[PDB]
Amino acid sequence: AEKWVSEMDKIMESRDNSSGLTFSIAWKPLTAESEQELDTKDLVKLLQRNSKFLNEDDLNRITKHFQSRIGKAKELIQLRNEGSTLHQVLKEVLDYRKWFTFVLSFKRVNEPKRELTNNAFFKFSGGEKAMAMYIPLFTAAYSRYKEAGEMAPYIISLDEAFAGVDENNIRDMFEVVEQLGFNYIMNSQALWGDYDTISSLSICELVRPKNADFVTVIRYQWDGKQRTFVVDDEHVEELVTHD
Amino acid sequence: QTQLFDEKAIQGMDILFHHYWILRAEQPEWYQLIREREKVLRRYLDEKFGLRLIVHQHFIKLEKIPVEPEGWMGIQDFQEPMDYAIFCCALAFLEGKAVDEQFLLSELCQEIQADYPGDFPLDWTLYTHRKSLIRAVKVLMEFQLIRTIDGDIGRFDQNEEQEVLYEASTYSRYFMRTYPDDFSSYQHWSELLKEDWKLNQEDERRKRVYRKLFFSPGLHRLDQQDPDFLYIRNYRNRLAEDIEKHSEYKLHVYKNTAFLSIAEPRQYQQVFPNSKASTDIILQLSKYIHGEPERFKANENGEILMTEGEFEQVVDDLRQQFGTGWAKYFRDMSTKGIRTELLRAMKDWMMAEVDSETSLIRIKSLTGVMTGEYPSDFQTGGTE
Amino acid sequence: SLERSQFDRLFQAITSLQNELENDLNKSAEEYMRIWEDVFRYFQTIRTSTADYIAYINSEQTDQRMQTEAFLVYKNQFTTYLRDFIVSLQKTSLQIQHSLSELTLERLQHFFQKLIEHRGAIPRLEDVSSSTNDWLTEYEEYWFSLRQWFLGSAVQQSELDILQWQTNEMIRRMTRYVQRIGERQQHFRSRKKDYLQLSKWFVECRDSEEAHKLSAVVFGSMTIQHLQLEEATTENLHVDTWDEAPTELTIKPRTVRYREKTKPGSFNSNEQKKKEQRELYLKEREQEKKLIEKYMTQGKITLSALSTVEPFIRKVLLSWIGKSMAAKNRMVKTDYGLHVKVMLDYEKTITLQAEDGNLLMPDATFLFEETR
Amino acid sequence: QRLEHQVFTWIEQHPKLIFSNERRQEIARSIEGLYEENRYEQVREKLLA
Amino acid sequence: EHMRSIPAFADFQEDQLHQQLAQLVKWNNLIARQDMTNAKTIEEYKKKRF
Amino acid sequence: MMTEAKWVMNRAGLLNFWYYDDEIFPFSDGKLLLRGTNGSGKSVTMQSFLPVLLDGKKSPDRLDPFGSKARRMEDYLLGEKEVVDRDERTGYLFIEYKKAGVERYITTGIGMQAKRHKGIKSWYFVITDNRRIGYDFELAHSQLGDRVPFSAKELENRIGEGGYVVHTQREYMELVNKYIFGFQSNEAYEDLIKLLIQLRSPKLSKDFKPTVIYEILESALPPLTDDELRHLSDTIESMDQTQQQ
Amino acid sequence: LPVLLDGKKSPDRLDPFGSKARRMEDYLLGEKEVVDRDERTGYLFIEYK
C-alpha cells in the first residue's frame, strides 16, 4: 500500500494541471486512542522499519505487540455482548487500514502546502473542485496499472460521469482522462461528449420508454468537432439491398 | 455498539429454518453467517417462537418442534415405518461406536437385526428389507452421521453379500435432542408435545401462532371460535409488519385460512407451485371448483365436502378437458390411481384431508388461493 | 535434533558475501570460493533439514498415530521441531529474504568469474571437461535455486512460504486433534435406551403418514413449505378464499406439442422492433428541433418578440432559463447539438403567450453557437 | 437428439436444397414430437417436399 | 516401497517381504503391533495387519 | 528494446442478455459513452461489461452499486418477469481487444445459463487465433431455423483449437490477466479491480467533497482475506475450547 | 409553514415525520462544513393582505 501511494504521489507531482494547482497525497500512521495499550504507532513503526535494519530484538518486540493485540481481541469478545465469533474480532483488531490514514494536500502557485479539508475545498472554484476530486481517483487507478505490464490497457468505468462538475468544466476532466490515456465506459443522462479535448469518442444512446422488453441502440460517432451517425459497412450493404 | 436484525440476520433465519442443521465442516459460509448474528437470532426466536437455538462448536441447529405434526414434516426419503425403525436402530448402534471408529456394513446389519424391536424379525434374505436398510443408510449419510470408506452400498439391493466399511462421525452424538424426564417413562409420542409446551406457558398463544405460520404451508380455522385464528385476526396488522420486518414472507388472512407467501424463493426452499406434475392437476382442480360455486358451495368452515365417488367424477371431468396436457405419467393411469396420487399430493400441502371414518374428502380453503390453466392457444390447440 | 543456528550460519555466510560484494571484486579468488562454499554448505544443510522435517510433518506415521497416546510422542517431537527449527527460520528468514532480494545474478557474475578462477586453481583430476561456462552456469543455477527458495517467484510460491504454510496447517490440525481428544473423553452419556424406545414407537406405526408425524414430533420438522405469490393481493379478513378473486397461473402443458426445454433456448432477434423505435425516436427529435427552429430569428430567440408559442417551446425555454443560471458561464447544452447561451434582463413585464395561460417572466435572449 | 443431428447434418451437406428457416422450424418440431404426436412420416415427407 | 526403490530389488513383492519380516521378528529385530486402529479398504479392515 | 504495443478495447457485445437481444457497442479508440433517459439500462449495461468481464466474479456485491445485495446476476440475465415472459435463457457477454497499430484481436467473454430462481451455471472463454465474433466466428447458429446460443461443449469445440474455455472464475481471471494485462501477480490485479469497483460507486455524485475520496481510497486497500486469518482464529478457538473443557 | 402558523420550532415540526435528523439551529446557520459561520441572527415573516 505504501508503494502504491508513493507511485500515486510521484505521478501527481510529475505533471502540471490546467487549474494552476498541484496535489500530493500521503499515507500516515495514526495515534492510538490511549496509552492503556501497546500504542499501535509503535507497532506500525516496527512494521514499516526496513528489513535490513531489523534484528532479533525488533522481532521479539513485534511478537510481543501481536500477543498484546490478540489478548485484547479475547478481552473485547468478553466485554462486547454482541456474541461475535473470535474470527470477526481478529479481523477487526488486525485490520491495518484502520492504523493508517490518508492526507490530501494542494499547493497553489508559489504558496505553502496545505491539507485539503472539506472547508478549504468549498472555497475552491468549480474547476479547482473538479481537479481536486478527480485527480486523486484517476491518479490512483493509473498508479495501480504501473504495477502491470506494458500490454495492459488502462481501463476505468465511471458511473453518472462527472455529475456535480459544473457543466463548463467537464472539458478539463476529459482533458485529464485523455492525457493519462484511459480506455473507459462512461454513462450519463445528459453528457454528450462533444468537448474539443476529446480526440475521438463513441456515443451510444439507449431507448426503452417504460416497459418495452427491447433496448434500442442509436450509435453515434465523434471526431472532436462534429457528431455524425454510424451506419455499418455490411449494414450499409444490407440497407441498400433490403429496400 | 449494538446489533440489529438486518439482511444478514434474515438470511441466517431462513438458512436455519430450511435446513435441519448447519455443519461447520461443510457449510462454513452459512455457519459463519449464522453465528455472527447468533445473539439477535437467539433473542428473536426465544421471544416470538420459543424454539431453542443450539449453537455448538461443530454445528448450529434449530429444534423445530411443531405445534401439531403433519405428514410432510417427517424425513421424506423414508417410505415405510420399517425405514424409521431401522434408522433409529442404526442410531442406537452408533452410540456404541467411538468417534471415527470404523465398522463394516455387516456388523451394522447384524446389530440392527438383533435390536429391531418388532414382533416380526428383520431378515436380510428379502429384497424389501435390504432396500429399507439402503434407504436408512442413505439418509444417515445425508446428515454426515457416518462417512463412507470406499465401497458401494447401492449394490446391496441386488447382492446381499455386498460389504462396506463405514466410519462413525462425531455428529452422531448430537443428532437427537434431549428429552425432559427419563424418556422411557413416556408411553406415546403425544406425551412429548405436552412436555415441550410445558416449558412455554408464557405467551403460549403467540408462539403457537408463529410456529404454525412459519412451519406449515397454511393455518386452517378449526371452527368458528378457534383461538389461534382469533389471535391472528386481532393482530393482523402488527403481525404482518413484524413478519415483513424480520423475514421475506408476507402474511395473508382469509375467513377460513391464513398463511405466509414468499415472493422470491431461493434455491434451497420448497414452495407451491413446483415442477411435480401433481401440482398442475391441483391447480386445474382449484379452477374447476371456482367455476361451479353453487355445486361446490363451501361450508362455513371453508371446507368443501366430497365423497370418493364425487371426487373421482371430478377427476374424470378434468382428464376429459385438460388431460390432453397432463404429464404422460397421469395420462396413462386409471381414475382411482390418479385420485390416490392427487390426494397424497394435496395431503402434503395440507390442501385437503381424508376423513378417517366416512372416507369423506375435505378440500380446505387453502386450495382456492391459486388457480391454473393452460395457455388459451394450446387449449384451442387441444380442440383441434 | 536440529541446530537452532542453522539459519544463523547461513545468514553469517550471506552477510560476508554482501560485505565482499560491496567491496566490488577487489580481493583474491580464494576468499570468494570459501565464502561460496560456506554459503552453499549451510544452504544444503537447511535444504536437507526442511526435506526431512516436511516428511515428518506429512508422515502417515502421524496420521495413524493420531488414534493413540503415541500422538503425544508425535506432539512432543513436533513441538521440539518448531522450537528449534522454525523459530530460527522466522527470526532469520526476513533478513535473508532481503539480502537475496538485493543480490541478483547481476551483482554476482564477476564474483562467479573469480570463483571460476579458483576452481581452475584446484588441480581437479575429475572428469573436468565441462567448460568454464559450464561452471558459471552451475553456480548461476545454484544461486537461482537459493533465490527461488527464499524469495520464490512471480509464478510460484517460494519454498519458505510453502514450508511455513504447511507448518501452520499442521499446527491447526494438531490443536484440533487435542480438542477432539477432549470431546471423545468427556461427552459419553449414552442415549441408547432412547433410540431403542424410539424404534419400538416407530414400528407400532400403521402407515407412512403416522410415522412421518412421529418423526416430526421426535426429531423436529426437517424443513418448511410455503406458497409462492408475487404480491399481498388480498386484504379482506371476512371473505373465504373461494369467493375471493384467485391468483391465475399459466400451467405449461407437459407436451412438446406446445413447449418443453432443457438445452439452451432460442431468442427472437427482434430487429424490426428496434428499427421502428429508432425511427420514431429520431423523428420526434427532428420535429422538436424544427419547432425550436420555427422561432429562430437571425440566429437567436428573444422572448418579447414571440407572439404566441407552442406550450412545448415554453417548457423548453423555462428549462433552459433554469439550467443557465446553474452554470456560471450561462452556457447551456441541448440534445439537438446546439450550444445555447442565455442572457437575462430582469426588469420587465413581458408575456409569453400560448394556447394555455399567459406567463409573465423576465425577458431573455438565446444565442446558438456554430457547431461546425 | 442424435437423429435430429443426423437429419440436419444431411441438410447442410446438400447446399443445393433451400431449407428456409420456417421449414427448418417445421422439421425441428416434427422430430421433437416423435412417437408422442406424429410418426416419422411427417419429417421425411417434408424432406421429400 | 523402499525395497522397490533399489534397482536390485525393484521388482520386490509383498509375500517375500512378509516371509523375511516374520523371520526377523522371530529374531527380535522388531517390535510388532497389530493394526486395528484404522483402515482404507474393506480388505485392509479385514486384514489383521501389523 | 521496444515497448509492447498497448491493447485497446474496441467492441462490446451482448447476446440474449437482459433486454438486450443482439447488440455490439463499438469503441472509438478505446473510449465509449452510453447515455439515455433513466431506467433505460445506462447502468446495467456498464455493470455487465465492467468489471465483470475483467475477472468474472458475478456475486451481488460486484453488480450492486451500493455494495448491497439488491440484485443477483440471474436477475440481470433474465430481466423482470413483469416485462419478459421467459424463465430460461443463455446469455453471452464479451469484449474484443485490439492492439493499437496492428490487426490482432483477442476476445474474452462469459457464458451463462439461468432458470428463474433455479440456479445459474457459467462458463468463460478466451479466443486467441485472431477470430472476431461476428466476422469469422459466431456464438448462435441459425440451425433449426431460430437462433440458439452455443452450449458449453459446442463453444469449447469451436474455440478449442484457437482458444481456451474454462468453467471456474479463478481460471478465467488468470487467463485474462495472463493475456491482456500481464500483471506479475494475481494480488495486484485483484486490487486494481477493487479500485475500479470503488470508482464506479455513486457516493461521488451526491456528497461531492474530499472525505468521499478518503473513503474510496481507504476501501480500495486489500484487507486480510479470511484464509490468512483462518489458521489463527481456528487455532485460538480450539485452544480456548480445550481450556474450557 | 407550519412554523409561522404557530411558532413551534422543535424538530418534530421540521422533519417530514418528526425525526431528529435536522434541527432549526442548523437551518438558521447552514451546515457546518459548507460555511464558516458559528453564530447568526435571522428572521422569517409572512405578510397578509
Ligand SMILES: Nc1ncnc2c1ncn2[C@@H]1O[C@H](COP(=O)(O)OP(=O)(O)O)[C@@H](O)[C@H]1O
Ligand atoms: N431484477 C430487477 N428488479 C427490479 N428492476 C429491474 C431488475 N432488473 C432490471 N430492472 C430494470 O433495470 C432498468 C434500468 O436500471 P438502471 O439502468 O440501473 O437505471 P439508470 O439507467 O437510471 O441508471 C430499470 O428500468 C429497472 O426496472
